[PDB]
Design a protein around this ligand. Structure first.
Ligand SMILES: Cc1nnc(N2CCCCC2)s1
Length: 211
C-alpha cells in the first residue's frame, strides 16, 4: 500500500475494493487529508465521486463559498468542493466519468481530460476527449468559469454550474423538477423537461486504464 494515496486510484491499488469513504492526501502530503467517497466498482473503480444526486434531500441552491468548500453527506447527496477539485486535478492528468440512471435506464459519459482551474480562473472547467452513451453535453460547457447565484443562469435555474447561456448539463439543479431547464438535466440524453433521478460525477487518473 501507498501511505498517503493522492486519489481513489492509489487507494484501490492499496487493496480498498469496497466503495465507501477513504482518506486521500492532496499532493501525497499527510497534512492535506481529505475524506472522499471512492466508487471502486464502476468501469474498473478508483473514482473519487465529487457529485451525487439520488433523492432530493440535499439543497444544491447554494452560494459561491459553499461550492468552493463542498457540502453534503459524502455517503448520500453532496458536492466535493471546487477548491478540492482544483487541487486534485492539478496532481496529474485526470479523466471525468458521469454515471446517470433514470427509471431503470442508464447512460454514461467519459472525458479523457478533465481539470478545474483555481479561484483566480473562477474554477474554469476543462473537458475534452468524450466517449459514452449519454451524449456529449459537457462540450457546450468546456472552458467556462463556475457560477453561483451570488457570483443570471444560477438564479434563473436555481442551481450552480459552469454555466454558459445557459446549460446542456444541470446536475446541481432542482431535484425532480421537470419544468424546462430547472431540473437535474443532461440535455443530449433526456432533454430539458426530464429531471434525472440519479447522477454521479467522478474523476481518476486518465492513465489508470493501463497503469
Ligand atoms: C457500461 C460501460 N461503462 N463504461 C464504459 N466504457 C468506458 C470506457 C470507454 C468505453 C466503455 S461501457
Amino acid at each position: 500500500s501507498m501511505p498517503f494515496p493522492k486519489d481513489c486510484s492509489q487507494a484501490m491499488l492499496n487493496g480498498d475494493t469496497t466503495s465507501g469513504l477513504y482518506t486521500i492526501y492532496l499532493n501525497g502530503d499527510k497534512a492535506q487529508a481529505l475524506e472522499v467517497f471512492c466508487d471502486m466498482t464502476s468501469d474498473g473503480g478508483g473514482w473519487i465521486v465529487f457529485l451525487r444526486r439520488k433523492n432530493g434531500r440535499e439543497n444544491f441552491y447554494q452560494n459561491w463559498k459553499a461550492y468552493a468548500a463542498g457540502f453534503g453527506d459524502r455517503r448520500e447527496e453532496f458536492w466535493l468542493g471546487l477548491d478540492n477539485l482544483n487541487k486534485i486535478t492539478a496532481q496529474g492528468q485526470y479523466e471525468l466519468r458521469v454515471d446517470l440512471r433514470d427509471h431503470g435506464e442508464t447512460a454514461f459519459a467519459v472525458y479523457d481530460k478533465f481539470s478545474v482551474g483555481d479561484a483566480k480562473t473562477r474554477y474554469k472547467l476543462k473537458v475534452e476527449g468524450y466517449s459514452g452513451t449519454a451524449g456529449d453535453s459537457m462540450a457546450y460547457h468546456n472552458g467556462r468559469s463556475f457560477s453561483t447565484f451570488d457570483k443570471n443562469c444560477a438564479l434563473s435555474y436555481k442551481g450552480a454550474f459552469w454555466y454558459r447561456n445557459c446549460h446542456r448539463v444541470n446536475l446541481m439543479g432542482r431535484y425532480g423538477d421537470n419544468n424546462h431547464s430547472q431540473g437535474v438535466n443532461w440535455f443530449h440524453w433526456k432533454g430539458h423537461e426530464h429531471s434525472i433521478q440519479f447522477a454521479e460525477m467522478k474523476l481518476r487518473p486518465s492513465n489508470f486504464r493501463n497503469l
